[PDB]
Design a protein around this nucleic acid. Structure first.
Length: 64
RNA sequence: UAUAUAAUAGAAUAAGAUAAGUUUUUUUUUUUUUUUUUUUUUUUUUUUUUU
């Protein structure tokens, strides 16, 4: 589901906050999501993914 | 070993038309003019009585 990947990416982002190439990790999870998970995900997971997305994209090489 | 906090100000002063919701004597006083009645006075005519 989406809640578990959201929590794992949140933990990885928090550990990053407290880093070389680590941004590749927890970015594969964002590329992991399929539609069927999204059509039934709750809003808590969505907010977590959005926050993690922004925090990662602060330092991404190219694109977002 | 944590995912999260939030607060500063000031003024004294007025325009103005909408086709609407009562009615319950009429009379008193003063003056002038005309008409009618009564009383008083004067003049004329007629009749009666007295000198």
């Amino acid at each position: 589901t989406a809640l578990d990947v959201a929590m794992r990416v949140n933990k990885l982002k928090r550990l990053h906050q407290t880093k070389k190439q680590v941004e590749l990790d927890a970015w594969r999870d964002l590329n992991n999501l399929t539609e069927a998970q999204i059509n039934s995900a709750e809003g808590k997971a969505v907010s977590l993914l959005l926050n993690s997305w922004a925090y990662f994209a602060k330092y991404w090489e190219k694109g977002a």
